[PDB]
């Protein structure tokens, strides 16, 4: 039902990232580009709770960036809302996630998405 319940219905039974993608599609008929439903926010919340991130939900977010499920803008905003900063491991994980899309930083959509990418940068 909620995205939080699905993401650990995905973490609980150990789902690989593509099986997570399929079952995430099946749980939600309207895709809504997954950014209306804030996939990046829920994945970052339930990944960056421990002193070190659990590699399962980070694998889910890295697949959801490398495959184009989630736009770069929602990821950059959800990265921006983290701070805390006392944990170096979560910060290094966020910088590897930024190392994925940075430089390409390409939006192929409406101009409002490009303005959102500007504000997100």
């Amino acid at each position: 039902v909620n995205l939080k319940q699905a993401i650990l219905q995905a973490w609980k039974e150990r789902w690989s990232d593509y099986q997570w993608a399929i079952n995430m599609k099946k749980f939600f008929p309207k895709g809504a580009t997954w950014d209306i439903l804030n996939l990046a926010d829920a994945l970052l919340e339930q990944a960056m709770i421990g002193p070190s991130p659990n590699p399962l939900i980070l694998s889910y977010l890295k697949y959801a960036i490398s495959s184009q499920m989630v736009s770069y803008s929602s990821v950059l905003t959800a990265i921006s809302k983290f701070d805390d900063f006392s944990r170096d491991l979560c910060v290094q994980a966020l910088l590897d996630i930024m190392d994925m899309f940075c430089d390409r930083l390409s939006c192929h959509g409406k101009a409002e998405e490009c303005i959102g990418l500007c504000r997100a940068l």
Binding site: R14, N54, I57
Partner: protein, 438 residues
């Protein structure tokens, strides 16, 4: 001819009759362990090899009339006497030669005296109960060598196993009721200098002071701290331990795979069953309230980018006991972390479990730290409890939650419940129950 000789010990072992034939059963025990028997009168028979000569009525007096050996012989337990001889033979399997063997045994005697004194100093400084000495004391509960059995220092007594089916230790603490390590001399290819006389001639009243070496001699052996069951230890511990002693822990670099796999093997193999669990690192745990599934998550990258990797250690070699207090404190730490993560590993067959299956999981964030991640008990976001194993008996845990969430628990209440009984599959139950009660 030699096979017929071994043949007769076997049929003489099943022979069981009166006292005359029981003395021939003692003769059978001798040739069973390849020992030589000389008997003076019916009353005294001596089995003699090297310095391992004992009489049931080299370089040392007969030490003691061990009640242990006397009780077994007086009662009908010739098998127990046979085990005791086996222990004596293994202790003196020492290669060396002759005069060297006598000196090497003398060095072991000095180490034993020093370790015993160090334990006595702790008891004088604090009148601690046996449990405190085992969990947090210099050296450990130490039983002096009796017959074949060598000195045993009890490094740690897990809270779950102190309780059996609420045991109070008293001074009657069982030899195997906990984790135990044995101190012994063993021959090595390399040559080392060891104390040949008690080195605690002068003891500072707090802690201990050791008079410097040379007395000593370069015998080709080192003191050892053999562990009866090999303890899985992580690469980081090897560096932390080396920093003190310096002696290479693993010398010839062998194999080094994920630590969580080795922890599972140690826990699963404590009780042996014919069917391999085939866990796939998804152990299922059943508890009085609720059902839980824990994924151990080995292969999660540490900050360095390498998964926690470690190799089973059976023997740790230390020249003098000076570095021993430091080495034990690091081990204590590695053992405690293994026990908390070990408590989860279980051989159950939770198949098609619709209710509960409140699955929990475990990622290696860093050496000495791990994160158990679970869905929030009342709300929906993922929540977790870390447990850095800072020391053998001390774990510090932080339950970070989202900005909008329901106060899951108070870190102190969980601690009180865990210390009462223990086990970490158990800690997750307390976190869920406390949150639900509120």
């Amino acid at each position: 001819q030699h096979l017929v000789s071994c043949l007769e010990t076997l049929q003489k072992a099943l022979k069981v009759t009166s006292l005359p034939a029981m003395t021939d059963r003692l003769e059978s025990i001798a040739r069973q362990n390849g020992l030589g028997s000389h008997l003076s009168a019916s009353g005294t028979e001596c089995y003699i090899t090297s310095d391992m000569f004992y009489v049931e009525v080299h370089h040392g007096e007969n030490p003691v009339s061990c009640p242990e050996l006397v009780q077994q012989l007086r009662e009908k337990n010739f098998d127990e006497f046979s085990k005791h001889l086996k222990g004596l033979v293994n202790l003196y399997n020492l290669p060396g030669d002759n005069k060297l063997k006598t000196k090497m045994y003398l060095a072991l005697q000095s180490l034993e005296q020093d370790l015993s004194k160090m334990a006595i100093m702790y008891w004088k400084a604090t009148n601690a109960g046996p449990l405190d000495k085992i969990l947090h004391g210099s050296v450990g509960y130490l039983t002096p060598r009796s017959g074949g059995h060598l000195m045993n220092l009890k490094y740690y007594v897990s809270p779950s196993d102190l309780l059996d089916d609420i045991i109070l230790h008293e001074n009657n603490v069982s030899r195997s009721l906990g984790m135990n390590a044995s101190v012994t001399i063993e021959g090595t290819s390399a040559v080392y200098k060891l104390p040949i006389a008690p080195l605690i001639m002068g003891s500072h009243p707090v802690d201990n002071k050791w008079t410097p070496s040379f007395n000593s001699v370069d015998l080709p052996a080192c003191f050892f701290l053999k562990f009866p069951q090999p303890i899985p230890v992580s690469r980081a511990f090897v560096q932390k331990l080396q920093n003190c002693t310096g002696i290479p822990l693993f010398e010839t670099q062998p194999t080094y795979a994920p630590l969580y796999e080795l922890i599972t093997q140690f826990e699963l193999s404590k009780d042996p069953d014919p069917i391999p669990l085939n866990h796939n690192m998804r152990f299922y745990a059943a508890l009085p309230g609720q059902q839980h599934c824990y994924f151990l998550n080995k292969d999660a990258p540490l900050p360095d980018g390498r998964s926690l990797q470690g190799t089973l250690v059976s023997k740790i070699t230390f020249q003098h006991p000076g570095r021993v207090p430091l080495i034990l404190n690091l081990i204590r730490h590695q053992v405690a972390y293994n026990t908390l993560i070990g408590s989860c590993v279980k051989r159950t067959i939770l198949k098609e479990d619709s209710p509960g299956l409140l699955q929990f999981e475990v990622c290696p964030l860093s050496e000495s730290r791990f994160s158990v991640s679970f869905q929030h008990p009342v709300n929906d976001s993922l929540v977790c409890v870390v447990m850095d194993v800072q020391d053998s008996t001390h774990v510090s845990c932080k339950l970070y939650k989202g900005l909008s969430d329901a106060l899951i628990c108070t870190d102190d209440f969980i601690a009180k419940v865990v210390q009462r009984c223990m086990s970490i599959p158990v800690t997750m139950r307390a976190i869920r129950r406390k949150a639900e009660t509120i």
